[PDB]
Amino acid sequence: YDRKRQDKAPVGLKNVGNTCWFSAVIQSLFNLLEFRRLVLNYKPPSEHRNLPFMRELRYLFALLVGTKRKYVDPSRAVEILKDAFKSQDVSEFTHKLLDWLEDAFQMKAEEETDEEKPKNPMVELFYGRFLAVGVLEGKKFENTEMFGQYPLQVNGFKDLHECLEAAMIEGEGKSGQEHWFTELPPVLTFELSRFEFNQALGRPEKIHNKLEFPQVLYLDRYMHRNREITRIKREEIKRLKDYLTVLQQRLERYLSYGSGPKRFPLVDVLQYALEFASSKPVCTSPVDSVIHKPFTQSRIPPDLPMHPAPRHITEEELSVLESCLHRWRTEIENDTRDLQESISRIHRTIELMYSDKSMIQVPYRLHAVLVHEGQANAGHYWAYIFDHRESRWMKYNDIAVTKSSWEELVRDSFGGYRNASAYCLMYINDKAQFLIQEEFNKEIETLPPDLRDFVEEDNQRFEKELEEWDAQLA
Amino acid sequence: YDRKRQDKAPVGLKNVGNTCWFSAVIQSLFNLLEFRRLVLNYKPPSEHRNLPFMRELRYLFALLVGTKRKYVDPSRAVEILKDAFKSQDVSEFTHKLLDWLEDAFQMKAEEETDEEKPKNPMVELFYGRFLAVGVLEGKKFENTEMFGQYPLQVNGFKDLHECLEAAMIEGEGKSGQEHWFTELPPVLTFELSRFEFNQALGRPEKIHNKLEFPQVLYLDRYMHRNREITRIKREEIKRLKDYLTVLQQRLERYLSYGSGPKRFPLVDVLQYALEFASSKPVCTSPVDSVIHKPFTQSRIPPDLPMHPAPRHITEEELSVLESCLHRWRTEIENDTRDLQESISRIHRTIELMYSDKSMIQVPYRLHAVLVHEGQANAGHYWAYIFDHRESRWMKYNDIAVTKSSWEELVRDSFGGYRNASAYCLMYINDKAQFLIQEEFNKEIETLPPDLRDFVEEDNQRFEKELEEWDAQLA
Amino acid sequence: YDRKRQDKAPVGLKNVGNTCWFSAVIQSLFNLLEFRRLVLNYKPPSEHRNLPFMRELRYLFALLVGTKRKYVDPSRAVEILKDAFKSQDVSEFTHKLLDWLEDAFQMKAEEETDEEKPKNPMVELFYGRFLAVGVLEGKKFENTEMFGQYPLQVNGFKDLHECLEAAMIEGEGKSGQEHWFTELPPVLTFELSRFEFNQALGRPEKIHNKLEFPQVLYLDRYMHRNREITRIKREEIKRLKDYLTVLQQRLERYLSYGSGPKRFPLVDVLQYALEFASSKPVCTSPVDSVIHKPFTQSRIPPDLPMHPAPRHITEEELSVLESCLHRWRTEIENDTRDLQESISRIHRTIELMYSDKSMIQVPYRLHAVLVHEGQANAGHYWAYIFDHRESRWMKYNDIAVTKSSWEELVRDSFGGYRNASAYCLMYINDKAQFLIQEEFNKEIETLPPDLRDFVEEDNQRFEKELEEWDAQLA
Amino acid sequence: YDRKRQDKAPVGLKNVGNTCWFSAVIQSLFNLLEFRRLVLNYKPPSEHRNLPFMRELRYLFALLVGTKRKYVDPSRAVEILKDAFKSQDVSEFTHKLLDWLEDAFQMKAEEETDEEKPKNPMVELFYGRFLAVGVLEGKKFENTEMFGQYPLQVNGFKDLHECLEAAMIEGEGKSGQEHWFTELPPVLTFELSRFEFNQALGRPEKIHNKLEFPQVLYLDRYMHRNREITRIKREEIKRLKDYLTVLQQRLERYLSYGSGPKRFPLVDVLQYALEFASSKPVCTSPVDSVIHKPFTQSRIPPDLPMHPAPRHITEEELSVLESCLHRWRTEIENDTRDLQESISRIHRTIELMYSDKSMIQVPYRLHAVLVHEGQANAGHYWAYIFDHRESRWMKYNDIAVTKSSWEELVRDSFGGYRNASAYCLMYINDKAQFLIQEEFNKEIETLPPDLRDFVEEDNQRFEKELEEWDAQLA
Fold first, then answer.
1. Is A238 at the interface with chain B, CB within 8 A?
2. Is B283 a catalytic residue?
3. Residues in domain USP (chains A, B, C, D)?
4. Residue in D246, D259, D375 closest to B375 by CB
C-alpha cells in the first residue's frame, strides 16, 4: 500500500463527493498548456472566495505537474466552490468556477492599467463573436454578439455538422433568423444537449441517438467570409435531399411490397410465385466409398411432389408464367440496383459539398471530450484528452488516467453504444498551434519558485512514506 | 397502531428470517381440518426436540383458531427446527418437520398397543402405494412401493396430465419401466421441479414454461384397475399425435413458404404476384358539402401508374396469370382451412380420450398450491388455499391473508406469466369429503381446555392493549 | 354437373369481370325487404339507359327470389351500367347505379302528381338531414344539410363511436365547426375510408388499424335533442382522458425504468439487485426408489458460489440492503397495482358515459357489412348480411352464400386480422322494424304476374337440364 | 440489334432450357487453360454419343476463344447429353458429362499403347487419393482410395476448414474412422451440401448458415506428412474450445442475469438500483441571447421529485448502498472485460494453431465458385472465376460475363446474405502454376486448323450481318 506515479505519467484526481465533473473539467483545462501557464503565472493582484480558490487551483496545478505520486486530492479547491452555494445545480458549480477565473484574470490583467485600458487572456481563449442575420419582423435586423460555448441540440441528427447547421438557423413577410461566425475563439467548445421531453414517459430524459463528430472539424462554412457560397450550397443540399427522398420512397416500395398489413420484397414474391408454378403438380394434400465427379451434387433430395403444389397447369400456362415472371424479376433486380446506385451517388455528392480548398481552410483539432453516464442530476463524468506530443487519446476517469484510443472514445462519446454519451466537445484551432500547445523553451523544474518548493516538500514527505515501506518489511 | 382480526377472518403469520416456506406449508396443513384436529388432540405420550416442537405447534394452531389478533409469531416453533441443524437446505428443514410429525403421531398412536400392533393417522393421510411394472432386464419385474408426494418434472409439458403420464413411464430384449397407482392417499401431493441445466449459462436454473393444472383432477387413468384401457388409449393418443405432426408439417409449408432464408405465407405471395401483374404497366421508374351515395367510397386514390409495375404485358399473358393464380389462391385458402380443421379435430379427440364415466370416477379437489418466486436457495414463498365452506380461493402471504381467485392463482402458479411459479400442488379426494373437511359437530369454543385457556388469556392480554389505545387518546 | 339450390336457400351471383362490388352491393339492397318490394312493384312510368337497367334489375330480383338454381348471371344488368362509361372508377359505377334508382323511383312516384307535388320512396330510405353549428369566422353560422352515407375516416381510432364523434367535429375569435343529426334515415350507411398517405412509401395506401363496430349502434348522442348533454359529457370525457394520460405516463416509468437506452421494469431491477447482494460471495471468477415427504423439493441445486456474486459484504451491509430493497419492491408492487386499478376505473367510466335510458333510445341493427381485400383500384369484394328471420349472419361471396357468424365477420371486417377490412357499414333503425323487414302478408308465389311467369319458365327450362342429367346415365 | 464482343472480352453462353448448370460448369473448365488445350488437341481416336458430344464441345471451345460475337449457342452440345436420358436429375446430366470426358480422354490416350500401358490426362487433373485410418471394429483398418470432388456438409460450421476437418473424421473397443490425403489433385474441388431435413417443415431443404471460404487454402494439415502434428493440434484446439465454453457460460451470466423469465445485464440492474436509491424521495405517486460558459450544460431539467422514487431513506442507508453497489458495478465492469479479453485471446490462439512455415506449405488458389439460387430441383445457377492474368474475379451468368469482385462473390456464395449460396468450390494448386495456367508460347490465331477455319467462316458470316446493319440505315 504505497502507489506513486509510473515512469512520470499523467496524474489523476481522487474526486471526493461524486463531484467528478470537477476532475473532468479541470483535467481538460490543465492539458491545455497556455491556460496552465496562465494559472501558474498568476499571483493575487494588489465575491472574494474567488482568490483563495485560484491560489489552491494554482497549488493543485503545481502538484499535477511535479508530484511524484499517482493522484492528488483536489478537495482543498473543491470545498471552496462547494460551500459558495450556502448562506445548487451541477452546471452552476462550473458556471461559477468559470466566472471566478474570468473575473480573477481580469483582476491581474488590471496591473498594467497604469498606461492603459483592459484586455483579458482567459476571455481571449474561450470567447468569440457571431453575427445574427435576423429578418425578425418584415424589416431586417443584424446583431453581432459574444459567445462562449455554442450550445447544440442533438435530436435527429447523425453528425455534428448536421447538428450545427440546424442549430444556427431559426425559422424561415415571414420572420426568421440565421447565425454566422465573425470571430472564432482559438479554444472552441460545444454543448450537446440530449435532454428532451418523453411523451410516453412523464418527463424530459436523455435522448440516445448516435451522434458522431470528427477529430478534425473544418469551420469555414459557418462564417461571413463564405456566407455567399454556403447559402448557395445549402440550397443544392436541400434540393438533393428532396430528390433522394423520392428515390428512397420509390425504393421502399420494391423492398416492402404488398397491399396487406405484412409486406415483403417484390423480388421474393415473384421468385416464390414461379417456384410454386414450377412446383410439380398434386391433387390430394389434406389426407395421405463412392467417388464423386467434379461438379455434381450428392444429397440432392428426390423430386416427389407434395406439400403445396398446384392441382393442374397447362404447358402453355407454365411457359407464359415463366416468360412473365422471370422477365419481371430481372426488371426489379435492376430497378432496385439503379435506385440504390442513384442514392449512393446523391449521398456522396452531399458528403463532398463542402470539401475542397477554400472550404478546408479553418481546421480544428478535437482536444477534449467530456462524457457523462447516468441520470440528469446524478451521474458519473469523465474525459478524453489528446496528448498532442505523444499523439494519443488519454482517458481521464477520476483517479485513473489510462492510455486510450479514438475507437474507445467513440464507444463512450457518440451515444447509442453505451449508456454514456458526450456533452462537451472541446476543439482547438490548428493554425493557433502553439499559442495553446507550445512549451515556452529556455536552454518539475518548470514551475515558479513558490510552487517548486511546496511540490518538492510534498514530494519528500511522500518519499518518507516509501522509506517507511521497505523499512516496514522487518 | 393496534390491528386485530376483521370480522373473525383467517389469521396470517409474521415469518421471522425470510423462512416463509414455514407459513406456506403450515397454513396448508392447518386448513386441512382433519390434520388440524389431530394436532389439537395430541398430548406428549408417556431426536427429542420432536415433542416440544409439536407442543408449540399445538399452541400455534390453537392461536390460529381462537386469537382475536391479526397474526401470530410462530418463531417459538420455528426456532425449534431452526437450531436442530447445528451441533442446511430449505427443503430439509421441512423434511425434518414432516419426520417429526410422522414419528410423533406414531408415538401417541402407540398408547393403544396394550391389545394391538401399529397404525399411524398422519401416514394414513399423506402416503399411498404404487405398483411398478418394470421389464428391467429381459425378464419382467413387479415392485409395489410406498410413496409420499409424487415428484413430477416440468420441462416441455403443457398440462399436468401430460406432465404426470410422462413422469410415470421410464424407458421402452429392451429394458423399461412403468408405474401405476395401487392405493391413493386421500391427501395427494405433487412436486413440480422446474430446475434444469442451462447450457447457455453455466448452471441449472428454473425453467419458465407455462404448466397448467386443473381445479378438479381425475386420477382413474393412473391405476391398475384401468391398466388395460389406459394402455390402449395411450397407443391411440400416440398414433394420433404422430398423425397431426404430419398435418402440422404439411401446414407449416403453406404458412412459411419459400426456398430462401426469409419465407412468407403462400397465400400472400400469390396474392401479391397477381397485384403486381394486375398493376398498371410503366417504363421509367429510375428517373422522373358533398352528399355521398350509399355504397360509394370517397377518398379512393387516382390510378396513376408508378413505383413498381411491369414494363409490358399481353392481354393474353394477363388473363392466363389471372386464371392461374386466382384459382391457386383459392386452392390454398381451402387446403389451409382443411389442415387447420383436421388438426382442431385431432386435438379435440385427444382432449376427450379419457373423458367419460369409468374414467371420471376418481376426482380430486385442488386444495392448496404452494408457489415460490426468486432464486434457487433464496426465495419468497406463499400459498393459495381453497376455503371449501365459503368456497373461495384464499391467498396466504406471510402476515397477509387475502380473499383471492382462481384467475389470480393461475397468474402466480402456472409460470411464464410472473417470475413466480408453483412447486407443490396439494389435491384432496372428493369422495373422502369429510374425513378431511368435516367439522365434528355437537349440539374459539372449539378447542381443548389446555389451549382454550392460553388462547383466552392471550386474548385478554391483547385486549388490554386496546383499552390502552382509546385510553391513550387523552 | 348440374347444381341447383339446396332446400330453398339464398342464391348467389356469378360476377363476370371481377366486378364483385356489384354482387356485394346488390345482395345488400335485395335483403333489405322494403327496397326489394319497391323494385318488384316498379314498371316503366309513361340518361335513358336508366330504365332498361331497372327492368333487368327487376328481372334479376325476381330470379333471386324464385329461381330453383344455385346462382344467377346478373351480367345482363351489369353490361348496362358497364358501357354507360363509354362515348371509369369502381366507386363511380355505383354512384351512377344509385342515381339511376334515385331518379327512376322519382319518375314512377310522379304518376300521382295529378293532384300533388313530389315524394321519393328510395330517397326516403337512404337520405337524412344533419345540422352544422359552424362558428366559421368570428360570427356564428348554422347550416342544415341533406346527407347520404356519412363518410368516416379511420386512422387512429379503436371503435366506431370514437371514429364518428371525431368525424363530426372540425376545428376549435377562432374558427370551428360541429355537426349534429336532425333527421336520421331508417337505413343509415357509413363509409370507412382507410386510405392515407404513407410517407415511408410514395403514395397513399390502406391503413390497417383494427377498427371495431357494434351489432347494435345507439345514435342518440349525435343529435340536436341531446346537443346539451352530449357537449357536457364530451368535456368530462376529455378531462378524464387528460387524467389517465398522466396515470399512463406515471405508470410507464415503473414499467420501463432506466437512464440508459435499454430500460427494464423497476420491480425486476430491485428484485435482481437483492438477488445479487443475497448471492453467496466469491473472489476469483476470471480463472478457475426414494419416498418424498409432502412439501419438500427434490432436485434443488447445491448452493456452491459462482458466476457473478460480490467479492465481499458486511452482515450489516446486507441487512441494510435487504431492509431497503425488500421494502421498496413492495412500495412499487403496490404503486403499480394502484396505477393500473386507477386506469381501469377511468376507462370503465368513459365506457359508460353515454350508457343508460335517454341515451339508449335510438338503436340501430347492423344489417350489412361490405368488405374489401386487395389494392386500391383492383380488389375482391364481398358482404355479410343479417338474416333477421333465421337471425344469423350470412356471408355473400359472389356465387357462394354461406351461413356465417359474427365472430367470422369480425375477422374480415375489423382490419388488422386479415388483409381484408370493411368499407361500408349499413345499419337499420330498430324502431322502424317492419317499414324495412316486414313481409306484406295475405291469407316464388310472392311475385308480380310479369316476373312469376319468367321465373317459372326459366325454372322449367332449368328443370329439363336435370331430366337430361338422370336421362344421361344411360 | 447487332451486339458483338467488346474489345475482345470473355464470351458468355445463351443457355436454352434453364439448364444454366451447363454454362456454369463449362465456363469453369474452359477458363482452366490446360483442360482447354486438352479439348482442342483432341480428335476422335481410331455409349458412343460420347464422341460427337466432344466434337461439338471442341467446336464450342473454339468458338469461345475466337468468336467475334458476344455469346454462343451451346445447345448443339447440350441437346446431345439431353436426349442421352431417353430410351433424369440435374446432377446426373453432369455426372455423365464427366464420364464422357474421362472415358473419351482415355480413348485418345490409348493411341500410344503401341509400346505401353494406360495414363489419363483428365483423370490426372481432377482425381487424387486419400488414406482412411479406420479403427472400425476392435481391430485397426487402413484403406487408401481414389477421390474426385470431396463432398462436404455445411450445417453448423462457420468456415471451410471447420467444415472440412469435421467432414474427414467419423466416429470415435469403440469403432471409428479418420481420413487423410495421400496425393492431392492439382485441381481440387469441394461440394458444399446444404440440404438437410427440416422437422418443422415436412421435408429436406437448403440450410442457410453463412459458410465462409478463403481465396487461398492451405491443405497441409490434412495429410499423412503432418498426421502426427495435426492430431496433436486438434487435441489442444478441443481442450481450448472446452475452456472458452466455460468462459462463455460464465460471461453469459453477467450479461443475461436474473432469476425470472426476462433477464438483463447485471451492470444495468446495479446501475439502475443505485439510480432509484439515489432518486429524490417521495410519498404520494398514485394521486396528484445568453452567453454560455465553457463546460456548462444548458437545458438540464429541474430536480423535482416524482414518478418512482422511494418513500424514505436514512443518510446511512444511502451511503451503505452507494458503497456496496458503486463498488460491485466496478467489480462487474471489469470481470466482464476480463472474460471478453480472455475469450478474444483463446479465439486468436485457435486461429493461429495451423499458421506458420511447415503448415503454410500446400497453398491453393480458389479458381472458380459455382453458385445456385432457387429450389432443390429447379434453380438458377452461375459462376465466379478468377482471371489470373488480369487478376480479377469475373462473374459468368449465362449470356452475361461481368467484371466482378471478391466482395460481390462473397455476397452470393457464402449464404445467409442472399437466397443464393455456393455449392462447388474449385481450387487449383499454386505450386502447379502453369501445368494449369500456362499459355504454351511460340515466337483466334491460337487454335488448330480445323477450328481456326470454322471460327473464321462463322466470324465472316456474323460480319455480313453488320455490313447489313449500317447498309440497313437507308
1. no
2. no
3. 11-430
4. D259
| CA-only gyration radius of chain D, Å | 32
Q: Which of C35, C130, C295 to mutate to test the interface with B (most CBs of B within 10 A)?
A: C295
**3 state DSSP class of D118:** coil
Q: Do the beta carbons of residue D167 and residue D155 sit within 8 Å?
A: no
CA atoms within 13 A on the CB side of C388: 17
B349 domain residue, yes or no = yes
- Do C294 and B98 lie within an 8 Å CB cutoff? yes
Q: Are strands B71-72 and B12-13 parallel, antiparallel or unpaired?
A: parallel
Residue with cell string 403514395: C203
| Annotated catalytic residue, options A208, A224, A380, A388 | A380
Other CB atoms within 10 Å distance of the CB of residue C317: 17
Which residue, C361, C376, C397, sits at the end of a domain? C361
> Which of D195, D197, D201 to mutate against chain B (most B CBs within 10 Å)?
D201
Resolution of the experimental model in angstroms, please? 3.3
Answer yes or no: do C230 and C276 share one domain: yes
- Between D205, D249, D416, which is nearest B202 by CB? D249
- Cell numbers that stand for D331 in this block: 467489480
Across C376-455, the runs of DSSP E, i.e. the strands, are 379-386, 393-397, 400-403, 421-429
* Helix (H) or strand (E) segment spanning residue D437: helix D433-437
Q: How many CB atoms lie within 10 A of CB D173?
A: 5
In a domain, C216, yes or no: no
CA distance linking residue B356 with residue A109, whole number of Å: 103
D128–chain B nearest CA distance, Å: 35
B94, B193, B298 member nearest C151 (Cβ): B298
Give the count of Cβ contacts less than 8 A between chain B and C: 164
Q: What is the largest CA-CA distance in chain B?
A: 110
Interface test with A, best of B245, B313, B324, B327 (most A CBs within 10 A): B324
In terms of residue numbers, what domain contains A313?
224-281+305-361
Catalytic pick among B208, B224, B324, B380: B380
Q: Are residues C260 and C322 in the same domain?
A: yes
Pair (D419, D448) in one structural domain: no
**Residue C352 and residue C396 share a domain:** no
Among C88, C85, C64, C66, residue whose Cα is nearest residue C74: C64
- The secondary element (H helix, E strand) that includes residue B397 is strand B393-397
The region, left, alpha or beta by phi > 0 then psi within -120 to 50, assigned to residue A37 is alpha
Nearest to D203 among A306, A375, A377 (CB): A306
How many domains is chain B partitioned into structurally? 1
Listing DSSP states for C287-318 in one string gives ---PPPPTT--SSPPP----SS--S---HHHH
- Residue C246 shares a structural domain with residue C337: yes
Question: Is C215 part of any domain?
Answer: no
**What crossing angle do the helices spanning A315-352 and A227-255 adopt, rounded to 10°?**
160
* CATH code where residue C390 lies: 3.90.70.10
The verdict on a CB contact (< 8 Å) between C260 and D271 is: yes
Asked whether the beta carbons of residue D297 and residue A145 sit closer than 8 angstroms, the reply is: no
B253 in reach of chain A (CB within 8 A): yes
**A469: in domain:** no
Catalytic residue among B347, B372, B388, B424: B372
Looking at residue C119, its amino acid is K
Residue D202 C-alpha, separation from nearest chain B C-alpha, in angstroms: 5
- The span from the CA of C258 to the CA of D309, in Å, is 12
What is d(CA B39, CA B44) in angstroms, rounded to the nearest whole number? 11
Q: Which of C329, C361, C393 is the last residue of a domain?
A: C361
Phi first, then psi: what are they for B394, rounded to 5°? -115, 130
Contact A10, A26 (CB under 8 A): no
Which among A85, A86, A97, A92 is positioned nearest to A60, based on CA atoms?
A97
With a CB cutoff of 8 Å and minimum separation 6, the contacts of C171 are C177
This structure was determined by: X-ray
